[PDB]
A paper describes a structure:
GalE catalyzes NAD+-dependent oxidoreductive interconversion of gluco- and galacto-hexoses (C4-epimerization) linked to UDP and generally plays a key role in the metabolism of galactose in various organisms. Group 1 enzymes are further divided into two subfamilies (1a and 1b) due to their separation in the phylogenetic tree. bGalE catalyzes epimerization reactions of UDP-Gal into UDP-Glc and UDP-GalNAc into UDP-GlcNAc with the same level of activity and is categorized into group 215. The dimer interface consists of a bundle of 4 α-helices and contains 8 hydrogen bonds and 4 salt bridges. bGalE has a typical fold of SDR superfamily. The overall monomer protein structure can be roughly divided into an N-terminal NAD+ binding domain (N domain, residues 1–177 and 236–262) and a C-terminal UDP-sugar binding domain (C domain, residues 178–235 and 263–340).
Since the recombinant bGalE protein contains one NAD+ molecule per monomer as a noncovalently bound prosthetic group, we prepared ternary complex form crystals with UDP, UDP-Glc, or UDP-GlcNAc by cocrystallization and determined their crystal structures at 1.8–2.0 Å resolution. The three ternary complex structures have virtually the same main chain structures because the root mean square deviation (RMSD) values for the Cα atoms (no distance cutoff) between them are less than 0.18 Å. The electron density of the NAD+ molecule bound in the N domain was clearly observed in all three complex structures. Figure 3B shows the mFo-DFc omit map of NAD+ in the UDP complex. In bGalE, the nicotinamide ribose moiety interacts with Phe101, Lys154, and Tyr150, the pyrophosphate moiety interacts with Phe12, Ile13, and Lys85, and the adenosine base moiety interacts with Asn33, Asp59, Val60, and Asn100. A loop region (Asp32–Ser37, magenta in Fig. 4A) forms several direct hydrogen bonds with the base, ribose, and phosphate groups of the adenosine moiety. In bGalE, the UDP moiety is recognized by stacking and hydrophobic interactions by Tyr291 and Leu201, hydrogen bonds by Asp295 and Asn180, and salt bridges by Arg292 and Arg232. These interactions are identically present in the UDP complex (data not shown). The cofactor NAD+ was intrinsically bound to bGalE without any supplementation throughout experimental processes in all complexes.
Author numbering:
A (entry chain A), B (entry chain A): 2 to 336
The structure:
Amino acid sequence: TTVLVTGGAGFIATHTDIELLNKGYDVISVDNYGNSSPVALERVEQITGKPVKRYDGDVRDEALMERVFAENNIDWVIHFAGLKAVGESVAKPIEYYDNNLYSTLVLLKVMKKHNVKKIIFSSSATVYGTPKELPITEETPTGGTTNPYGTSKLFQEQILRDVHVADPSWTIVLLRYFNPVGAHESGLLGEDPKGIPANLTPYVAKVAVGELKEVQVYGDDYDTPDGTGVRDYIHVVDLAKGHVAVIDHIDKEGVFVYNLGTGHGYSVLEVIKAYEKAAGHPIPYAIKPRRPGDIAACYADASKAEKELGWKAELTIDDMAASSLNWQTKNPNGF
Amino acid sequence: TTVLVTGGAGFIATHTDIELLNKGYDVISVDNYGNSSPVALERVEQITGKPVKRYDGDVRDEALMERVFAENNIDWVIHFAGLKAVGESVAKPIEYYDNNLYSTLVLLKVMKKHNVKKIIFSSSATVYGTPKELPITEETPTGGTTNPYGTSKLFQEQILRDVHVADPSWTIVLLRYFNPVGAHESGLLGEDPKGIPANLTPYVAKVAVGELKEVQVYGDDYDTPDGTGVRDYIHVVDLAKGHVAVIDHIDKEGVFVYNLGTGHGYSVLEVIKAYEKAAGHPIPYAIKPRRPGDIAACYADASKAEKELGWKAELTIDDMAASSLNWQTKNPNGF
Ligand SMILES: NC(=O)c1ccc[n+]([C@@H]2O[C@H](COP(=O)([O-])OP(=O)(O)OC[C@H]3O[C@@H](n4cnc5c(N)ncnc54)[C@H](O)[C@@H]3O)[C@@H](O)[C@H]2O)c1
Ligand SMILES: NC(=O)c1ccc[n+]([C@@H]2O[C@H](COP(=O)([O-])OP(=O)(O)OC[C@H]3O[C@@H](n4cnc5c(N)ncnc54)[C@H](O)[C@@H]3O)[C@@H](O)[C@H]2O)c1
Ligand SMILES: O=c1ccn([C@@H]2O[C@H](COP(=O)(O)OP(=O)(O)O)[C@@H](O)[C@H]2O)c(=O)[nH]1
Ligand SMILES: O=c1ccn([C@@H]2O[C@H](COP(=O)(O)OP(=O)(O)O)[C@@H](O)[C@H]2O)c(=O)[nH]1
Ligand SMILES: [Mg+2]
Ligand SMILES: [Mg+2]
């Protein structure tokens, strides 16, 4: 069973690549290294002892994607490729819509052309906007998205649903990730974006090891216990295993939706505290204005994935922080 | 004042081109002739005595669109280019999403690059799905779209809104057209799609003049007085004038939404009857199954456009049918 992983050098992909390779799947990566290093795929190979067939380029490049499908016999696709920062998306809507919508459209056109009809799409808790209920289930209504990133994910989910209307032999799996954090236990692979990290924990990790000065906490006036945002942090290794569970267990046509989270919500300040516990020292932080597009609180009821896929995310916030710091300590400038 | 009209050779565009040129605007067309003839632009020039600067190609072709903006000083863009059949869209979602979303994205990227920040977008009553209330106003909630065409229009409206969030110096005008019908009074220009017409009235016109055999009426079990679909038919010349009214009256930043309709709803059978009155003979029709994606009834309250733009569509269903038949009689195979 051969899996094409778009955005295959990124944070969640490389963890997923490991878990697929350890289960005996063959993995192919396409990535443009906009937010990742090719060295990450060398580290996947080192950890697993297994190859990742590497393609370098853009998923919007039809000729490149044609080559990928012509040269390989692909069973499944996991589509991670995308731009993913809520705040940046508000400032750069056309960059987000172009990259995110058109990568998906070029991919689907090539998949259809080759009769490859099994996809896992990397969706997001942001599709729920301001959550109609907490904890969020797969029955919680979607919409009211607050930012072009989240909007783009909901748009893509609808595109994919309409592919299955038009050709119900597809298997579409919409995985709504909450907030993945942490690093492979080896410390040889972890989160390493380009530029200043946009997500909270890679930033916090870098402040903890002295590579950045101060955690910027975006807003303390949300309707939450301490006023900072609340999120369902999930260990990236657990999230990676969730993808393997889909491919192990779903071998029929249909549209399948899962929330992938822990059901444990932590505030920004609580995250910092977990890191301070892992580091054994204070981690400087400052209260800053709200970041556009952020909502107050979102966390998952992941019952459905446990029943249907046999999967549960049980690594803890301390496992997340410790594994993150292990990676960052051993690799302070990343790859 | 120079107006770029994408899809500039199509049905509504060519009527609009006339009305702009008669008011002293300069017009530039980009079209790929997927659903139109270049001869239509010759007929615009003949009627007006004025030139249309013609570009042949795809709005998704960034190099072509760069040439258009580099070679011309554009004030306004009217973005008509799109695929527009509700039923076809259900069968061909990726064709629709690619053409419709990516044309809009390439256009916006080039417009931003050249600081051209005034757009009229061709939107649709389909964005309201099954209407929450009748008649529909601009306060009627959008969503619940039933088909990828309508979905694509609502998606594009959101993209455009997010452009204005990111750069509020834009002028975004979202015109939700109802159902345009008819032809310029000269009979030298009218609706001439490629292949079998997808819209009701060009099909009916062709049956009336003996070029098609039988009107296919899609469904007679809707919750309407006679069971067939009900729509707000608007004369294409009135609709064209509505575009000129926008450009004449809006010269400030912001997002402006208008429903463009008559407020008069007619069933499919009523449309056929108007054509039979115009033709002086029965026009054969058969009841067929529902077309996927169609809803029962939609018609507009266009108060807001009358107040804000000074515009009202008062040509009647008989004006529509007569002008259509005048065109089709004089041009039975179109252009
Ligand atoms: N908190 C999270 O990290 C989170 C939560 C929900 C969903 N997601 C989604 O999961 C996916 C992966 O997230 P991640 O944290 O691993 O981010 P990431 O930035 O590390 O991974 C994405 C990868 O895609 C690549 N890429 C982006 N656009 C591309 C294109 N057009 N062609 C080829 N390569 C492209 C990037 O270079 C990067 O390696 C994204 O779609 C993201 O929106 C992430
Ligand atoms: N009832 C209606 O006709 C109606 C109602 C609401 C909205 N609209 C919208 O108004 C617009 C015009 O409708 P119309 O009836 O004139 O249809 P049309 O098919 O006659 O006009 C559209 C034109 O766009 C061109 N085109 C399409 N994709 C293109 C691309 N990628 N690059 C360049 N050219 C392209 C076609 O060749 C055609 O000439 C469409 O966006 C449509 O969705 C139509
Ligand atoms: O540098 C940062 C990045 C994020 N956050 C906050 O931390 C949480 C998680 O944000 P992130 O960008 O990691 O993920 P998101 O929840 O937007 O997908 C949110 O409440 C953000 O407001 C923060 O305070 N500082
Ligand atoms: O050949 C046709 C085309 C359309 N219709 C019906 O006529 C109305 C207008 O359809 P059209 O495709 O012209 O426009 P739409 O309302 O979908 O934008 C709808 O109720 C359709 O079900 C029909 O019965 N026969
Ligand atoms: Mg091939
Ligand atoms: Mg230029």
